[PDB]
Design a binder for this molecule. Sequence first.
Ligand code: GSH
Ligand code: GSH
Lengths: 142, 142
Amino acid sequence: KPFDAFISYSEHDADWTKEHLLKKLETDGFKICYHERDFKPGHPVLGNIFYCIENSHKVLFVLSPSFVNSCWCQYELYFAEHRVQDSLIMVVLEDLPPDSVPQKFSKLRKLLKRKTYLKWSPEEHKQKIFWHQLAAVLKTTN
Amino acid sequence: KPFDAFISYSEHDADWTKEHLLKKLETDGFKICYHERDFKPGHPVLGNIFYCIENSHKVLFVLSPSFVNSCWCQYELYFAEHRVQDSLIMVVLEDLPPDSVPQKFSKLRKLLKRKTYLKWSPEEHKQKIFWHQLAAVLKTTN
Ligand SMILES: *SC[C@H](NC(=O)CC[C@H](N)C(=O)O)C(=O)NCC(=O)O
Ligand SMILES: *SC[C@H](NC(=O)CC[C@H](N)C(=O)O)C(=O)NCC(=O)O
């Protein structure tokens, strides 16, 4: 695949995602797809939602209440769930209240219940581990 | 079902949809679901994308290039395609260039190729027929 990851995130989380997650990954040599930059309306290749996920090794979701509660983010979750499995990566930027994910997102719900995510932390020491573990998970097979 | 239709439309088409389609249908006694009014972030029942479609007899899409070319609208199309069949209703507000719908929306593509939509017209006479035919299709069985 030409991209290591397609990244999805809420508008609320855009500043953090662009300044920390995307900056770090791209500075570290990963090739990233994301719609805000790479979706081109009307373009026959780049102007549809299948392009990024079909051409990325992993799909990474930045999760927070703002993401889970958004109509548009829920549609994006639905799409990844139903299209995409080892290729899914969940980053918990802010804790999700219990049972706040709609019950019909049963795959995402099982992943969270099974503690298969990486959790952001404000502490330098934990953030250092976070970035190493995020690089590791991006390089796993599918 | 408590609602006759869940309605999806692009931001570009919002003014026309609210002032003509929604006004007419609601004045004419139809009960309509749509996220701009009826999606309530954080609400355990009303704050997820399954609520409207699970509780509406029909799903109606207002189609135009602005709809087909939008990332968010494509996600909404994907969801209806994969969740929802006789329950789907397509209203063509503005002509779609040939092959502009992404190829993986194969159900929507077959519906358009098979001429199963209602087309808006600026002419009073054709609009009169349009509204009668739209009421008729909303009342068909699934
Ligand atoms: S998770 C879906 C939305 N995210 C974004 O808007 C981030 C940028 C987009 N990916 C883009 O512009 O391409 C989101 O937060 N939903 C909007 C809302 O508040 O409902
Ligand atoms: S078709 C998806 C978007 N439609 C709307 O924004 C209409 C109102 C929403 N249903 C709502 O606020 O709940 C759309 O046009 N996408 C935004 C874009 O330009 O990409």
